[PDB]
């Protein structure tokens, strides 16, 4: 029975007290020469191999009897992602590796510079 707006109103009550104490310089009068900040999300689907294995981990590990917040349970959170990030394991077994492959080879011919974005040394 509780609405977001009520919670928000409480946040408002505190937030809007900081008017004369808030200083802010904005790039509205600075960023006079830059391109459009474009973004999108890719929709990569799992292969038979990948789909079966991330589910198999969930079916065979029995994390809720191990109890939650345990090493293999929590590892499961990462493992279910690692099914496409690793698996250990040629890239033909990973839709993600195939998407990256295709995009970089496209840009290879386009002559585009490109960044890859990853939050892990193991990765």
């Amino acid at each position: 029975n509780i609405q977001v707006q009520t919670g928000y109103k409480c946040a408002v009550a505190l937030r809007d007290l900081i008017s004369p104490y808030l200083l802010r310089r904005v790039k509205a009068d600075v960023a006079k020469d830059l391109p459009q900040k474009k973004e999108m999300v890719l929709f990569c689907k799992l292969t038979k191999y990948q789909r079966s294995k991330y589910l198999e981990f969930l079916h065979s590990s029995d994390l809720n009897q191990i109890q939650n917040g345990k090493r293999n349970v929590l590892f499961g959170i990462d493992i279910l992602r690692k099914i496409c990030n690793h698996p250990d394991g040629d890239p033909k077994r990973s839709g993600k590796m195939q998407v990256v492959k295709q995009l970089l080879l496209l840009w290879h011919k386009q002559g585009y510079k490109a960044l890859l974005f990853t939050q892990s040394r193991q990765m």
Binding site: K53, F57, S61, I79, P87, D88
Partner: protein, 49 residues
């Protein structure tokens, strides 16, 4: 044949009297406790293991 000892006919024993067979079984399996970590049955070697 005292104190529960016995004297037996060796030639009857030689003839197979009271012989019996003995059987024993063994069993095993591969991938146990590890995700995608499959242990395996395969002929070993000291340089290979």
């Amino acid at each position: 044949n005292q104190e529960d000892s016995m004297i037996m006919n060796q030639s009857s024993i030689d003839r197979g009297l009271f012989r019996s067979l003995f059987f024993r079984s063994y069993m095993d399996q591969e991938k146990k406790y590890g995700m995608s970590i499959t242990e395996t049955f395969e002929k070993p070697q000291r340089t290979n293991t």
